[PDB]
Design a protein around this ligand. Structure first.
Ligand SMILES: CC(C)(C)NC(=O)[C@@H]1CN(Cc2ccc3c(c2)OCO3)CCN1C[C@@H](O)C[C@@H](Cc1ccccc1)C(=O)N[C@H]1c2ccccc2C[C@H]1O
Lengths: 99, 99
């Protein structure tokens, strides 16, 4: 798909067998989802952005379908305003910026 | 050009006669630049990012050249760890997300 940016670049994702709305975010190094339950062992991690740092749970090697494309990588879960798919997964689906 | 996401999508920009490095961020609604004293009037504003809200100064109709392409729009100035080009400017240079 080719996506314009006049509107937030949101796509549907399926994870843990559940559907969710996520934002394709080229400025995010990692992927972070709102608080939710994921199977598997998690490790406490901290990530920072604008506003400061937050504490999150890191789940490794999680399968996730992003708008029909398949990826398997690290997924962070914590107090974020919205689900964000970062560069770690975006590259897995051959996502690029063009103009 | 086509920008890959293996690394942060950093490009050179020109604003206020100064050259800077800025991140092409599809997840940012607005454009936020590191502290710099631009001439002109501005209005106070609050923007939220991952770690909370930060107070910024909003300047309107600022000419900015992104990787050679010209654009003009609202730019927020404040204590951000990096310069961020949001969708308000990305749509002006015809930037798209592709996969
Ligand atoms: C207009 C601003 C700029 C304030 N927008 C954002 O920060 C939005 C916020 N939403 C959320 C939002 C939505 C709506 C809101 C709100 C916040 O507040 C009020 O309304 C979540 C997505 N971000 C976009 C991020 O792409 C920005 C990016 C900035 C950055 C890059 C590099 C170093 C420091 C800061 C960012 O936060 N990046 C970090 C990042 C992000 C995720 C996972 C790992 C990492 C590390 C790092 O790359």
């Amino acid at each position: 798909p080719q996506i314009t940016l006049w509107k937030r670049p949101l796509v549907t994702i399926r994870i843990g067998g559940q559907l969710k709305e996520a934002l394709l975010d080229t400025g995010a190094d990692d992927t972070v989802l709102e608080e939710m339950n994921l199977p598997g062992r998690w490790k406490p991690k901290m990530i920072g952005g604008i506003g400061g740092f937050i504490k999150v749970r890191q789940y490794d090697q999680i399968p996730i379908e992003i708008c029909g494309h398949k990826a398997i990588g690290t997924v962070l879960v914590g107090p974020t305003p919205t689900n964000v798919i970062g560069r770690n997964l975006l590259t897995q689906i051959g996502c690029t910026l063009n103009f």
